[PDB]
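Why this split exists: single-chain examples teach little about how molecules sit against one another. For that reason, every record in the complexes split bundles all components of an assembly together and asks for one structure covering all of them. Below is a record exactly as it appears in the raw files.
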Amino acid sequence: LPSGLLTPPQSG
Amino acid sequence: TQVKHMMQVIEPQFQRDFISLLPKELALYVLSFLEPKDLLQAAQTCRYWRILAEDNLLWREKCKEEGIDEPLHIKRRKVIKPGFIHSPWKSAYIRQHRIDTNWRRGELKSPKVLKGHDDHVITCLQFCGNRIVSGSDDNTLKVWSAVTGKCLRTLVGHTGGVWSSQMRDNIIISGSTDRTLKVWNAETGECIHTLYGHTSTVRCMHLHEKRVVSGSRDATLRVWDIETGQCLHVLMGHVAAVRCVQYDGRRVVSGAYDFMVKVWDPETETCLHTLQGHTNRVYSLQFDGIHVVSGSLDTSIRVWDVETGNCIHTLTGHQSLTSGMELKDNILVSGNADSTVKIWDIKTGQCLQTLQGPNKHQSAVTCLQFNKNFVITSSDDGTVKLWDLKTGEFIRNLVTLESGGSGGVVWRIRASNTKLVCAVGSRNGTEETKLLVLDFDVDM
Amino acid sequence: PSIKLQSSDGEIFEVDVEIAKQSVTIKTMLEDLGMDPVPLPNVNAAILKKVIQWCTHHDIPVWDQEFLKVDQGTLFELILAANYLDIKGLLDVTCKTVANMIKGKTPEEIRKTFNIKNDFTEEEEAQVRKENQW
């Protein structure tokens, strides 16, 4: 994923 | 009146000029054909002219021009000799001109630094008249004062990271990985509702009046009542995670990782339309009640007609993920991982400007804001840039993190007419996470 | 048909109605008060003769721009005749022609064009420049 962008870590 | 009252008190007599001799009214009819830049020069001609150029009603209409709607009634006190009846509308117009000039070439006043969320990230930012709300994966949110600097409250309660947020004077709403949403009281900082229903991370949410719609990694959306704390409807139909959502009180629009955009009528929990076209995850959305605009990992941005489900434009040109978009009056601005920002006319589909050049961003554009004069962009390059919306030209770097090239990043920005709030930090330890508040207000 | 109107000078003008009715003032006196010869006390034969010329001819159009290539004294006259006669078209065009004389910035330059004396005192001018800064 491009650097500077985010998302919560995978849950399951 | 007012202009008459001025002539009979200052007594500007004997002028051998055209307008000084014309009946008051006709001089005003004439001065009206001038643009503000001129009225301001004409006002420096002589006392008689100055008094005319200050006709309150001449400016009230010149403010509607720049969309002011509100005249400012300023600073009182021990007058300089020969008085002058200033025009509230004129000073209001000038205030804005100076503010615009401050943003454009002002002189960066070192910003208030608000330290918080240590070694963590800021996932969402909210700015509402003097109050700032930061959301983090440290499981908290912090309400700040854009005026002083101080943290006013820290909303502790979630057991997972906060990833979504919304606010409307004193009502804050958060969405966490702990699968719940929480309605808070910004002033007291107390949780007043905890909304259960989603089983997977609450990814996105859009608030409209007394209702909020949330999108989750469980492939569903839920519409809640911010007052009762009840879940009113559940939109089921998406196959993959719902990454973005828009709600106008009439229709719910959503984009998910199934390359689909769905238009819903919440009341009857029904999917009116499933918009097909994107060939990859849809990350961003915008909706003005008539057009739904979607941005995908597929490089394109699609413009659809909410009423028919028909695709109207397939905006091509970007090269990577369009992370953020802003729509306003059929003018769309998109921020993309290709480090570019684009300005489009969603009526014609024309790409009005591409913000690049020698001073373009070096990495992905993380956020953006815009108005009728400028576009403000943030990036992982550690800068926040100011661009001219009409010419598409670069103006200057509002923020330039010294650690920009080695980790420092600007995750998000919120701008009011008078100030800029930046969420800053880093994955390594080169930049302590914090908010930066720049002030572009003028002394008046 | 054709109606007759008398300038302030005492000179009678014959003009096709409709051309004359472009002036609502004249229009009002003809259709409402019913003035056989329409007395125009605020307009003299000279200027009246000019407005008639402008009317019989009907973003500043190319012609009105030439037609108003007159000297200030006349323009000032036309502004008033138009206002008095109430001819929105003529009024706009002439007033606009004067405005364009200002569009160009510079206080000092606007004076050379309208004469005007800088009656501002040391402090006053300094203050005036501060307030209307751009």
